[PDB]
Design a binder for this molecule. Structure first.
Ligand SMILES: [Zn+2]
Length: 1016
């Protein structure tokens, strides 16, 4: 019986939106705890019968790229940290250490000799070395898509299970810049029992600490019953470094970072150095330290205290291991033997801490509050809100989403078969998963790494895209060739991928033209793949070398097509205008492909000597003063010219869109009769402050509200076709395109911020929707959370991640903007939405990156814009912290994130070609997705296993009967099923053996994983 995620407002002790509405956020000087208060404790709280149990947990934060690349850090730091951890833990049985980043650990362990592997396995098995989280990385939580958070978690944990025989159940996330409830969502469905977070707004830490609500059961915002809850520990202070982890006074705690005495090149900024512990000072030093611990303990409810002991790339040299270990051992020996402290302190691991906390809870010592909400937008001090990284390096943010889809499609397409090892399918998929997983790091997708590190991530992702293409095209060839003809060369490219939106028109000329001609090749097969588990139609386009091309399906049924020119925009450095040029030798052909669920469909493009019966030609109108001619080769319609003017377009029976004379949307009319609803796109710019703190890769510190971009008299290109029309305009730094295909328009911005230093370009929508101070943004592509604009916070605090969409609404009307890339955005006034396109910042923002953001490159951002009437929708009540998409907005998001894949057959003739794959696949209800399909076994396994992650979203009920679909049972998608299990989302633990080998569908907002096993 599925929980209702709409109509029941959960009762939680802390609801972060409500807390935000009540909190004052005053930034007062709290004393040595600058953002807190002077903590007081009663010395008599702890006594012989009630001691404070202190776990000092050594750690080393290892960034998989940040100011050096992964490999540079591995060579210069991490391999030494791990080698010396292995030696020192081996030699010191009571010493402990936690490790989070499995990308580094796997890199290290595979290079170890067998003797050392065995030693390493032993210190893990005996609990000295403990993995925390066990993902490939410690991912960003703002920009990352939940699918990639799960991918990287699975990549690390699958490695750990295979090589270390452990599966962490405690998560450690000390570094991401703000925290998302998507993490406890995924972790709780992946076996976890506990998680730790750190980077939350200093005001939130103060507020929760005052109420001893820093440990809480974190449930999802829609979860009325609480089954999603995951115990969460929030660290209370400003950093995870040693000065901010022993207690509230960093001037004292820094004295207990024994790497800071000088020979290591480190010191304490509070000007009191550590001193080596001796018999003559250990009582005074213990008094100071235990006092810090007892103050920290006042912020929490049990008598078990967590004291992290670590910092970035710590525990590298042997002398550092010694200096920390020996000094802490001297303190523990003293403290634990002095009854008056009533403390027992020891090195521990994270799991040991949580185990002891829950023993205290079970003993009735504490009850923990429940919490829902998120922890964005983080500020670590004053007005320094970390909303810049929601946009920084947007090229790679978009690339993340492209690769996300490519990985899913490559894993799904190749899962249908078992492949010989010679095919290198598993090799290529592992590479692709690992490079995408690496980029989920909190300096990867966030855009907060040095320029050469961003290049390394991009190069890795490019190799991952090539790997996905290889696997996908080999799979299509196999799936659509008569078996007794199939004759693969696993190194050959049978197909090339054609992607219209990455890197994108104006970004890279990467797309192959299908070259047809009477004297070379009459026709070409193309194949579309649909990774979604429902039948799908989508227009697809290809470049062709003639306008006289017609399309057939493989029953030779004509398919209606539209040919349009190939337009490319040029920054004309002679005329100082931005204007489009059309090709005279290549053309776009567009047609509707209809593709089975999780399936493939083949079409044929054929040249003819003149206009074919079922192909139409778009008209083109270039609006500008001072036009010049625009020849288009054989294209049969001459370009028309006019002065700038307002224009209106309608494709099919879809909305009618009206545009200003600058080529920007001004209104949407949903139907013939209905009103022209004002919806106005505008581009604006934010600058940087000339006094005080400067924006950089992390921080957004605008110098006031944005100023409109001066547009001049831009050139507007209108293409009008039966299947697709568009309005494109060359604005300064953005070629802005509105594309209409009969439903909600697609927006594409080719953003080139050029050399505009200290500028952030924002795209705003202005409407007269009476949204007030409310808007909705998504978290990791998984859920939409209610936001409230707070004028008591500065502008940048009202920016939130827009990882896949945002909307505003009133009682009657909603405007949703779906994105194909994570970007930052807000609603800074009633009726507005805005989303940042790019930012170019000359200054460093003091968070360690040591550079601004001056490596911009053109990026094609894509969106869908859905205006809808919502007065008939069953929406959550006014107090509910969630919102939900409509069917149309969800499909529009899927059209961006998981479009059809397009394959062009590379050779002249495809012998044995088949017309379709997957026609018998069930077409599941529109809210269900097969987020992952992954064969889990190599071909030598007698029992093959295939893993599926199913995700059901929740779409609002708005009165559309919309029904009859088939049940999707993933366990029967492959034949000869012998067992069906429900598993954790990482596939690593079987949770239920399923009757009848039937994988039941999941409830709204739930995600489940199943593994089918097959005997043949
Ligand atoms: Zn980090």
């Amino acid at each position: 019986q599925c929980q209702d995620v709409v109509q029941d407002v959960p009762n939680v002790d802390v609801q972060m939106l409500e807390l935000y509405d009540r909190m004052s956020f005053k930034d007062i000087d709290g004393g040595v705890w600058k953002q807190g208060w002077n903590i007081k404790y009663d010395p008599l709280k702890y006594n012989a019968h009630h001691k404070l149990k202190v776990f000092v947990v050594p750690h080393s934060h290892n960034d998989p790229g940040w100011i050096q690349t992964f490999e540079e850090y591995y060579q210069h730091d991490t391999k030494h940290i791990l080698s010396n951890a292995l030696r020192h833990l081996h030699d010191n049985p009571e010493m402990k250490f936690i490790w989070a980043e499995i990308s580094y650990f796997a890199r290290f362990y595979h290079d170890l000799g067998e003797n050392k592997k065995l030693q390493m396995k032993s210190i893990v098995k005996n609990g000295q070395l403990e993995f925390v989280t066990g993902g490939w990385v410690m991912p960003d939580e703002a920009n990352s898509h939940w699918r990639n958070v799960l991918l990287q978690l699975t990549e690390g944990q699958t490695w750990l299970k295979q090589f270390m025989n452990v599966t962490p159940t405690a998560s450690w996330a000390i570094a991401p810049f703000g925290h998302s409830p998507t993490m406890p969502y995924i972790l709780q469905k992946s076996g976890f029992k506990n998680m730790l977070i750190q980077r939350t707004h200093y005001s939130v830490k103060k507020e929760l600490a005052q109420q001893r609500q820093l440990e809480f059961l974190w449930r999802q915002i829609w979860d009325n019953k609480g089954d999603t809850a995951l115990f969460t520990h929030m660290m209370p202070f400003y950093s995870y470094d040693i000065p901010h982890t022993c207690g509230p006074d960093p001037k004292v705690c820094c004295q207990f970072d024994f790497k800071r005495m000088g020979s290591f090149g480190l010191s304490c900024p509070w000007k009191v150095p550590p001193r080596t512990i001796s018999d003559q000072n250990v009582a005074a030093r213990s008094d100071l330290l235990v006092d810090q611990w007892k103050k920290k303990a006042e912020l929490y409810r049990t008598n078990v205290l967590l004291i992290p002991l670590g910092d970035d790339f710590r525990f590298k040299q042997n002398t550092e291991w010694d200096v920390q270990r020996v000094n802490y051992e001297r303190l523990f020996e003293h403290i634990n033997s002095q009854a008056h402290f009533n403390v027992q302190a020891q090195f521990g691991t994270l799991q040991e801490y949580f185990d002891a906390v829950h023993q205290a809870e079970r003993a009735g010592q504490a009850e923990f509050p429940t919490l829902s909400g998120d922890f964005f937008t983080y500020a670590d001090r004053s007005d320094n809100y970390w909303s810049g990284y929601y946009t920084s390096r947007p090229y790679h943010k978009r690339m993340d989403r492209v690769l996300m889809h490519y990985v899913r499609a490559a894993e799904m397409l190749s899962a249908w078969h078992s492949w010989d090892g010679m095919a290198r399918i598993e090799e290529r998929l592992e590479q692709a998963r690992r490079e995408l997983s690496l980029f989920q790091h909190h300096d990867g997708i966030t855009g907060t790494a040095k320029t050469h590190v961003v290049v390394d991530y991009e190069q890795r992702m490019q190799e991952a895209l090539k790997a996905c293409q290889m696997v996908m095209q080999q799979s299509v060839y196999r799936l659509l060739t008569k078996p007794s003809i199939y004759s693969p060369d696993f190194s050959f490219s049978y197909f090339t991928l054609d992607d219209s939106r990455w890197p994108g028109s104006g970004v890279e000329d990467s797309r192959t033209t299908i070259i047809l001609g009477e004297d070379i090749l009459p026709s070409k097969h193309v194949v579309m793949h649909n990774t979604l588990p429902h039948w799908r139609e989508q227009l697809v386009d290809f470049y062709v070398s003639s306008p006289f091309v017609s399309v057939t399906d493989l029953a030779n049924n004509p398919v209606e097509a539209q040919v349009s020119p190939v337009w490319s925009w040029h920054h004309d450095t002679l005329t100082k205008t931005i204007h489009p040029q059309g090709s005279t030798t290549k053309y776009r052909i567009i047609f509707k492909a209809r593709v089975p669920p999780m399936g493939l469909a083949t079409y044929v493009l054929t040249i003819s000597d003149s206009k074919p019966e079922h192909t139409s030609y778009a008209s083109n109108l270039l609006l500008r003063k001072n036009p010049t001619s625009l020849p288009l080769g054989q294209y049969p319609e001459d370009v028309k010219f006019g002065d700038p003017r307002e224009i209106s377009l309608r494709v099919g029976n879809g909305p009618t869109l009206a545009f200003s004379e600058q080529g920007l949307l001004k209104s949407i009319q949903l139907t013939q009769d209905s009103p022209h609803v004002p919806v106005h796109f505008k581009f604006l710019k934010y600058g940087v402050r000339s006094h005080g703190d400067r924006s950089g890769a992390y921080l957004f510190l605008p110098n006031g509200p944005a100023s409109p971009v001066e547009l001049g008299q831009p050139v507007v290109l209108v293409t009008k076709g039966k299947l697709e029309s568009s309005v494109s305009v060359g604005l300064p730094s953005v070629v802005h395109q509105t594309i209409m295909r009969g439903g909600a328009p697609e927006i594409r911005n080719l953003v080139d911020i050029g050399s505009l230093d200290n500028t952030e370009i924002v795209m705003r929508l202005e409407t007269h929707i009476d949204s007030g101070d409310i808007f909705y943004t998504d978290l990791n592509g998984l859920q939409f959370i209610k936001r409230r604009r707070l004028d008591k916070l500065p502008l940048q605090a009202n920016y939130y991640p827009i990882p896949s969409g945002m909307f505003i609404e009133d009682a009657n009307t909603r405007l949703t903007l779906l994105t194909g890339q994570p970007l930052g955005g807000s609603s800074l006034a009633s009726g507005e939405l805005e989303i940042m396109q790019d930012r170019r910042l000359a200054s460093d923002d003091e968070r360690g990156l040591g550079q601004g953001v001056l490596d911009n490159k053109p990026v094609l951002h894509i969106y869908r814009l859905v205006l809808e009437k919502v007065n008939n929708c069953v929406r959550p009540s006014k107090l509910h912290p969630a919102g939900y998409l409509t069917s149309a907005a969800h499909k529009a998001s899927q059209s961006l994130l998981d479009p059809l894949d397009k394959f062009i057959f590379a050779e002249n003739e495809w012998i044995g070609a088949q017309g379709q794959f997957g026609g018998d696949h069930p077409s599941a209800r529109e809210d269900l997705d097969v987020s992952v399909m992954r064969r889990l076994t190599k071909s030598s396994a007698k029992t093959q296993r295939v893993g599926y992650v199913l995700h059901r979203t929740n779409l609002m009920q708005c009165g559309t009967p919309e029904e009859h679909t088939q049940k999707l049972d993933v366990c029967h998608l492959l034949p000869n099923v012998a067992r069906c299990e429900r598993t954790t989302l990482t596939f690593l633990q079987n949770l239920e053996h399923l009757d009848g080998m039937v994988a039941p569908e999941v409830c709204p907002m739930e995600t489940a994983a199943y593994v089918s096993s097959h005997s043949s």
